[PDB]
Amino acid sequence: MESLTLQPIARVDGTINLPGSKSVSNRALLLAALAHGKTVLTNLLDSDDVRHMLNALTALGVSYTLSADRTRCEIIGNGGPLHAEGALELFLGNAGTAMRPLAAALCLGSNDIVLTGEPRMKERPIGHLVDALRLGGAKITYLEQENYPPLRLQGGFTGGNVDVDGSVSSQFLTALLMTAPLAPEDTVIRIKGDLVSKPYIDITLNLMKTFGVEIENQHYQQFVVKGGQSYQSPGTYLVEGDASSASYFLAAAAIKGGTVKVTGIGRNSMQGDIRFADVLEKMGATICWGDDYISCTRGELNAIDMDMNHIPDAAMTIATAALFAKGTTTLRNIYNWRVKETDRLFAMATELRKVGAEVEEGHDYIRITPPEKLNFAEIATYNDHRMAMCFSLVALSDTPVTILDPKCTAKTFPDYFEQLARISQAA
Numbered sequence: 109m110e111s112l113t114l115q116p117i118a119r120v121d122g123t124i125n126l127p128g129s130k131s132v133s134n135r136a137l138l139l140a141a142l143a144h145g146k147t148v149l150t151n152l153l154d155s156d157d158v159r160h161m162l163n164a165l166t167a168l169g170v171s172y173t174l175s176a177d178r179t180r181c182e183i184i185g186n187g188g189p190l191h192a193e194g195a196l197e198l199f200l201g202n203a204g205t206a207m208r209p210l211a212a213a214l215c216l217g218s219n220d221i222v223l224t225g226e227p228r229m230k231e232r233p234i235g236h237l238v239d240a241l242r243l244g245g246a247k248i249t250y251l252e253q254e255n256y257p258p259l260r261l262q263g264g265f266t267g268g269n270v271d272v273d274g275s276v277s278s279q280f281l282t283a284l285l286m287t288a289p290l291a292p293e294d295t296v297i298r299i300k301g302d303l304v305s306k307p308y309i310d311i312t313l314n315l316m317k318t319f320g321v322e323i324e325n326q327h328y329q330q331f332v333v334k335g336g337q338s339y340q341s342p343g344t345y346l347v348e349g350d351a352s353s354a355s356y357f358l359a360a361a362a363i364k365g366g367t368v369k370v371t372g373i374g375r376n377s378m379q380g381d382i383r384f385a386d387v388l389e390k391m392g393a394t395i396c397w398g399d400d401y402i403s404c405t406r407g408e409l410n411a412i413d414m415d416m417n418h419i420p421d422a423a424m425t426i427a428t429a430a431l432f433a434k435g436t437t438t439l440r441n442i443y444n445w446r447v448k449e450t451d452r453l454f455a456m457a458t459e460l461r462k463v464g465a466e467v468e469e470g471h472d473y474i475r476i477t478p479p480e481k482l483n484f485a486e487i488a489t490y491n492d493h494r495m496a497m498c499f500s501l502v503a504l505s506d507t508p509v510t511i512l513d514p515k516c517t518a519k520t521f522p523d524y525f526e527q528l529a530r531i532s533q534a535a
């Protein structure tokens with residue numbers, strides 16, 4: 109068991125050029141692979157989740173090249189649905205943005221492919237997506253537990269009237285949206301009831317439009333898709349910096365700045381997590397917006413009580429920032445935290461108590477009352493990059509913190525600790 113101990117950070121100040129967005133990177137790679145023409149992606153993220161997507165594309169026969177730092181990628185588009193037979197197994201780690209999108213995309217035409225991943229991935233739900241794909245004609249088999257990967261995909265998705273549940277994950281709808289335009293028949297995707305974390309659907313539609321495809325969005329209740337379409341290379345495409353990765357640095361300034369500026373995202377970004385800056389502002393920090401930057405300057409930090417379903421990933425950063433705020437913070441409507449890299453409600457509550465907080469783990473919310481002073485703890489990270497990054501903020505106090513398995517940050521941000529250190533000042 110590897111570990112990293114962070115010594116107390118007296119002040120943070122500086123500029124961070126953000127790594128590329130994981131959400132955008134994996135969507136852009138799949139669309140580039142399906143598209144006609146060569147796509148040159150710049151500022152692509154190099155992390156575990158993107159490497160699993162690249163490996164899957166290689167296994168499916170897609171040709172591409174990567175620059176030395178793996179942030180520039182020239183993809184030779186396949187000009188249509190990807191194919192493989194022989195129950196070829198694609199190992200997708202714990203990458204939801206590879207597993208859900210490929211589960212749908214590979215249902216086009218004929219195929220015989222198996223999608224699997226790490227143990228936790230076999231415990232992350234995919235049943236609602238499989239139900240929708242089957243309504244459209246896909247043949248899918250659960251090889252282990254019903255409603256979870258691994259899946260054996262044998263193709264057959266032709267389109268038609270498909271219902272999909274959007275109450276557990278927005279990724280199921282994202283996967284259907286990217287796939288449907290290439291189906292031979294027109295598709296009408298009806299959302300059964302509620303739709304969680306809607307901003308990710310906006311990211312998906314933005315990327316599809318960049319690749320030449322638009323659909324009819326009827327108030328996020330129904331999506332009308334014309335079949336027989338083709339994705340087209342946009343030529344050169346710049347991947348936005350990651351707004352979720354940015355949260356740690358902006359929060360660091362709200363707690364211990366100084367001013368921290370992150371570049372690569374700005375007011376025009378398509379990522380919902382830029383709204384994390386609004387939460388810091390509501391807590392008392394000062395935010396500055398640019399076309400290609402967002403900065404946060406220390407003001408004060410007061411507890412908040414808010415629905416965080418629109419920014420589930422960045423919301424975890426508020427849970428550790430709450431350790432430094434005045435009053436009790438409550439984050440609500442985050443049941444979805446339970447079905448991600450780990451059950452984040454359980455994990456966050458457990459680790460927060462270790463540093464002294466009084467925490468109520470609600471079924472779908474978390475209430476955090478900070479201690480007068482934090483104490484040292486060895487933080488368990490649950491193979492979850494965000495647990496490591498969120499708890500790194502504990503060091504913006506008088507106590508060091510030890511983070512177990514620090515390399516788990518590589519899922520989305522291999523250089524996280526170096527970057528935090530870049531803005532860490534002793535004076």
Ligand SMILES: O=C(O)C1=C[C@@H](O)[C@@H](O)[C@H](O)C1
Nearest residue numbers: 131205278279282308420421
């Ligand atoms: O579609 C996406 O890119 C994502 C959607 C949400 O489930 C997030 O929680 C997940 O980390 C990424």
